[PDB]
């Protein structure tokens, strides 16, 4: 049983080396799927649907 609220606020993010040219476009895709809500569908897939 999970009880009590979150003790803090943390976030899951993709690790990319500093100066990597891929950080910006990949982060753009992050904003895309986030705005596309696919994250919700997959989180429901691997958390709620199963």
């Amino acid at each position: 049983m999970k009880v009590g609220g979150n003790l803090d606020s943390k976030g899951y993010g993709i690790a990319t080396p500093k100066g990597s040219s891929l950080g910006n476009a990949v982060n753009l895709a992050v904003l895309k799927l986030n705005e596309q809500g696919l994250l919700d569908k997959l989180k429901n897939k691997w958390w709620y649907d199963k």
């Binding site: 049983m1 999970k2 979150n6 943390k10 976030g11 993010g13 690790a15 080396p17 891929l22 997959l42």
Partner: protein, 133 residues
Amino acid sequence: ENKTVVVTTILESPYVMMKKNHEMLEGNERYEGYCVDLAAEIAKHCGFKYKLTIVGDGKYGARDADTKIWNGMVGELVYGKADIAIAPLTITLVREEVIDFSKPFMSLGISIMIKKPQKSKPGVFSFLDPLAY
């Protein structure tokens, strides 16, 4: 020319785990889970080739207090051993101070796990329950 991206990760459910028949599977298809389809669609939008790889030391990544060396996927990216790390990784300052993190796709907090004490209501004996038989 374009090259295959070295994608590092760690086996973690429901994020990353090997398929039940992985032994007769090859390459990226040997694994399964949330972050698998995640990075998959990442390559879908960004249009590149990638390769799913497992972290060597089986850790998230930490900086030695003595040798100052970052281990795990952290050191992998720092030492160029990997191209990108997509995993249920906590974002911390010391981790920001060495590499770059994208905007958080999933916000989490500390959780409290306890047992589930279940006391089913009796049907028969609950009648004569209060004092004693």
